[PDB]
Swiss-Prot record, chains A, B, C, D, E, F, G, H, I, J, K, L, M, N, O, P, Q, R, S, T, U:
Effect on the protein upon substituting residue 28 to L: Strongly impaired ability to homooligomerize
Protein name: Interferon-inducible protein AIM2
Residues of the full protein shown: 1 to 94 of 343
Tissue expression as described in the entry: Expressed in spleen, small intestine, peripheral blood leukocytes, and testis.
Assembly and oligomerization: Self-associates; forms homooligomers in response to cytosolic double-stranded DNA (dsDNA) and the dsDNA seems to serve as oligomerization platform. Component of AIM2 inflammasome, which consists of a signal sensor component (AIM2), an adapter (PYCARD/ASC), which recruits an effector pro-inflammatory caspase (CASP1). Interacts (via pyrin domain) with PYCARD/ASC (via pyrin domain); interaction is direct. Component of the AIM2 PANoptosome complex, a multiprotein complex that drives inflammatory cell death (PANoptosis). Interacts with PYDC5; disrupts assembly of the AIM2 inflammasome complex.
Additional note from the record: Defects in AIM2 may be a cause of microsatellite unstable colon cancers.
Species name: Homo sapiens
Upper classification of the organism: Eukaryota, Metazoa, Chordata, Craniata, Vertebrata
Gene (UniProt): AIM2
Recorded family membership: Belongs to the HIN-200 family.
Length: 95, 95, 95, 95, 95, 95, 95, 95, 95, 95, 95, 95, 95, 95, 95, 95, 95, 95, 95, 95, 95
């Protein structure tokens, strides 16, 4: 169930709140944290980006490295919100 | 039929009468009343904004929260007009 | 033959004269007059919109409800032109 | 007959009213409610999605979990409409 | 001879005018009107679908239930055309 | 007579409702429940598959293990339908 | 002479109109109505099947049980046609 | 010799120019013009179809009813070509 | 000499032009026109079939009942050819 | 040879010079001039459209009705070019 | 009389229900249970096989070893049926 | 070749020399000289405007009516230049 | 020896190079050139076809009429090759 | 050997370098140069197309008419390449 | 029983969760781990791929090398899931 | 008795588990291990193949060379299963 | 090799250096130099434009007419650069 | 033994690694290297193709001409692999 | 003794290695080398064929003409093997 | 093993990192380095492109010419990365 | 890791701090330092500009030539900041 909650955190809170140019910055910094080939990243939307991130690193490190890339882009609000949702889920299932 | 009348109130009277900068203020205050992800709000036009509002909260609370956000922006004329159209429709179908 | 004339009225006079944003308003008000599922309306062009309207309500009520939706959008010129073409065809075949 | 009515609710009201990107979000959240292998979900259309949902969980829990996934995606209008149609059918055959 | 005319109505007017996705919707709603096993419906074309419908319910109830399923799919134009052809044949041989 | 009813359940309800790829999955899981040599399973159709299953395990355990393999393939609808038909026949002749 | 007419009904109308897979379904359901050993049914053609049916139950119960097995296979058209030919012969010689 | 020329017209001009799906439509409309049992039509190729048509109605009415069925399928080009070849042969031997 | 000509008509034109399955249909319908015991018909070839037909009914009624059985099997071409050869011989010796 | 020249006029000059949306308008107006079932028109390309037009009305009336439909779509340049090529071929072979 | 009943069990229930390839498997496993020379088994039919089995081991051990060879071939249905008939005869005459 | 020269006159001299607001005036006066649907004019650039003008009236009347619309907008310099280029081409090819 | 060379031409070059469907076309056109009864042609292979052709018309007219039937089937390559081999043998023994 | 070189020219240089839509144009223009029945052309691939062309006109006129059809489709590069390879082979064996 | 559990792991968890393009990558990397001839891999589906893998290396090394190839394709989620299911089965039967 | 057990291993485990194409590969590699004339191998089934192998090399070397040929065909699963059954029988009778 | 160098000149130097609106001007002037149907030009990118130009006129006249069209559009810099690269290649291979 | 090794090279390495369309190209080029009649090549599989090649030219020239035909089809990898296996066998037995 | 060795060469190596269709080709070419009446060849098996060949020409010319007929059928492998065995026997007894 | 490493370099590092338009440029420059027919390149994806490159030139020259084509497209980063991976593998296995 | 740090320097410090007109000056001076085709530069944003710079020259020379172009534009502050970040990274990883 923690997989599903990290899917909702990653897609619904994280990727849905960034704009299109911010999505292009995010795809510009995916290849330095994930070892994902950029040739399918180049035209992906938010759902395919979440599918490549969860598929290529797991949901836990997908959300954690999403926080890391959002801190690379100086998006302190969204990184703070993903840490709040992530700690609510870690409180939810790790306790 | 009340759904269609609230669609005409929301799009035709409400959103079509605000300008582009006023639309950007409106999108700036959508996220505090609707729980809509802003990443698709950022480049939406009036029709897509009405589609996200009606889709994400229903037409009744969409128009009512439109009145509320227009009162947050001190647009007393448009909020008064949406209350007039809304009470004409509530008189039309609720009686 | 009246089917073909109402096809020419609907596509050639009606839908071809509205712009793209006006087409999006038109698709925003199709679901309140036609019981058409919007999931295929969302990316349709004018030909597919005319195909769904004629397919889902017939050409006669398709053109008549096109006049009705154009009067919902306050497009009095195009609604007047569709009534002129529609009465020329009704004069043509109904007499 | 309740199977057929839940088929009409699921395909006609539920899946036909969501767009293509919303369908991709829906497929992104099918695997957390259904235990359906995603490799055939990835290129399915609405009919094949309804066939996998009804085939893999039954029509009743298919429509009920459709309401649940639509509430995960914050689609309160479509979830409300599926609850209205579902309660009309449960009133129709359960009474 | 009425069998042959209902074959021409069913295949030529009815099934040949629906598209491929509409054929998949039609096959999705065959099992609720015909008691036909879907395992051979899944890859059938229009001719094999007409053969299973006429074979499994007769041509008269095949065309009549084709009108019924087309009214389930909100295809009012094709259902109206099948009622026009069906009443021309019933006028042709029943009178 | 119970042999004939389980033949109608197995062939008519069970095997006729699965598609061709689902039949290939079913043949892929026959060898783990039946001790049937796969060399004649590889090109069999539904009738020859039913003949090898009834011939190699009897009709009762053929239908019961059909329910078991359909539950291995997560086909809850068809397994539920075979349990409904099987309990109608067990009610029919065992009572 | 009624024997010859039931031979023409059974072979010419009944068995010649079913296909090869339908013939295999028919042979799959012969053993539940006729007490015929299946070891010679397995490779028979339509003429040998008619010879075993007429030889093992008579032509009258052969055609009547052919109608019964065709109603087991949901072949309502062919069962209706065999009842029409059978009642034309029973009208022909029984009156 | 007219038999051989109508064989060349039927097989070489008529049946060889229709595709496979058009052949299945043709077999779907053979049973309404020829009184041929469909159970051997179902898997026949063009040569066996020509053999059943010439065998069951003669070559002259075989080609003439081929023109009639091609006009049922709205194949005006092939029906026109078969009338041209048929009138060249009737000019060839009838004069 | 008319006996020899009807032998050539029966064996050379009639029985040699039907195939093996058509020969089995012919043997299936010999017992209704000839009062021939089928136990020697079951493995006969065309020459032994002609010997039993000419031996058991004479050559004239053998060829005439061959035309009758070929019209029972809807073989209008071969029945027409046997009537043409039979009328050439009846013209040859009866005039 | 005039058939081949009208094929080159129809495919090479006529259909190859219209764009994809213009092809969809053309398919939208094929059903009013040709009695072609639209269910195969819906996904056809230019070659299959030319095959259905030449197959269903002949090449001469195919090109002439192509000029007529291009004049329905106000494509005066392409209709003028098809009349120029058509009159060059009619000058070529009719004189 | 028990000899005759075991003859009816062996030939009528046992050997008549196996197919030709199953008969060849049965002959392939006769030489390991009966000490029968295979040179006359190689072209025998079911009657000659039953004659060699009853002649070479008696009817009782013929039927019992038939059950044993059918259990070698995993034919649990036919072995179960031969045990049912064998126990009906042993109940019939041994009690 | 005169078609190409009028294309160079229309696009290169005529439409490329007017500004964006002048292009919007030009599109505002296209519908009174060309019978072009304005819904695609509304967002066209100079190349698409030239394509709709040449496509919908030919190059000769396209350039001549371009001169006429430029004289409606009081653009005497550009209308004079298009008459100079047009008379250089008419001198070039008409003499 | 010319008989043997025409046997090698007919079987080895002619009949061995045509496929199975082409062999069925060839058998479909044997009866118009050879007066061979088709009832043994229907299941013959290439060797039996060559035996009936050489037996029923001689090897010389067998190969020459093979060229003629191959020219009826528009097989210009194989007819050209049989004319080349036939003229090599006629050069070989006729000179 | 010239046959083999023209096979390599036709298949390897000619047909392998055209795409799928270009192959459909090529099949659309085969019937005007070859007298090949289109019913087997409709689903052929490049190898079967080369087999029908070489089989129905020889390799020399097959390649030469391939150049002619490629010049009908304005494929000057591939027609030039086939003329270069064809003249290299004609230089190779004709000199 | 461990064979059956590794079949369910390989087909149900492993191959059913990868998409079609991912299946083509998987087939692209089968030949480097299995010594399987690719000529039958090229058009196989998931069931035939699982049959060739289990047939050509056993189920244990089939699943283990499936994990290895999924780690070659950087599919860490599916490789982790196959290691979880594989260790649940090794815990299930190895302990 | 070891002869009978190796017969059950060879036919039941070995040859019955390979498919038809795998049987043709097996027959393709029989002649390199057995000195069996292939002219009777070419149309044999599994029982006749087992009869020629046991007849021509004995059951022990028949099963052992079956393992060897299955290892030539890279069928490691079936070769492993035949070694398991062979070592169970060698444990059974050699100890 | 000169073909490859003119491909690099045309795509890399010529078409890659023009913008999107300049590409639309270029496509607007392709039809006056190439006899290319514009219906596939309308949505092509630079690679498909280069493929249609090289395919429809050869690489040499493709680059030379590219220089000519660039001089029609007054692009003296790019036409000068294509003449410089073209003369470097003509110096490279023509000397 | 060299015959067996060249059989394993030809079937296992050579023909099993080419796909089905590549097999059809291979059969298209067999007739230019082997003097094999194509009428049995047309429906052969890889085993029958290897049987005709080894039967009609020997295994040594079969593998060597397989390398030659694979170099005609530009399959440098498979031709290189067959030369590697062929030189391993020639090293194995020729030294 | 040379008679016996040529019997073993002819029957065991030569005739036993050809298939049934190849035996029919061989019988088709026996009459051109042996002056054997074909009426007993038509149903002979390999042993009776060897008996007629050795009886009608001696064993030496029987084997030598067997090589000659196998070279007529392009069976270079079997002709080479018969020459190898024949030269081993001629080395065995002639030296 | 070097073949597998160059497969991983070519597909995983090289082709997966280029986008779709870059893939179309790559396919535009494949025909100048590989002698691959472009008709199957035109719709290939990255896996089929890698299969044609490795199949048509080997993996070593496939990767090396991939570096060469990437240097033709000025992709210095990807060419540098393929040289780094290629030298890591050449260090891995060549040392 | 130095690649990622130079990506953050180039995009985050360098390109994000210049305005839109300064970005147009930067694109105006990219073609003199990078050999990048300007046709895709013309509408690129900062992310696509960074992708073309890093893709076309590497990250190190991308940042260094960014400093060089910023010194061409007299942007001494941003060039100084990029030298400070670049020397912090060169201190970070080069020491």
């Amino acid at each position: 169930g923690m997989e599903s909650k990290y899917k909702e955190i990653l897609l619904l809170t994280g990727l849905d709140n960034i704009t299109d140019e911010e999505l292009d910055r995010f795809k510009f910094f995916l290849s330095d944290e994930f070892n994902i080939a950029t040739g399918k990243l180049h035209t992906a939307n938010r759902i395919q980006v979440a599918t490549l991130m969860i598929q290529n690193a797991g949901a836990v490190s997908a959300v954690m490295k999403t926080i890391r890339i959002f801190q690379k882009l100086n998006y302190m609000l969204l990184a703070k919100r993903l840490q709040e949702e992530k700690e609510k889920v870690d409180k939810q299932y790790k306790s």
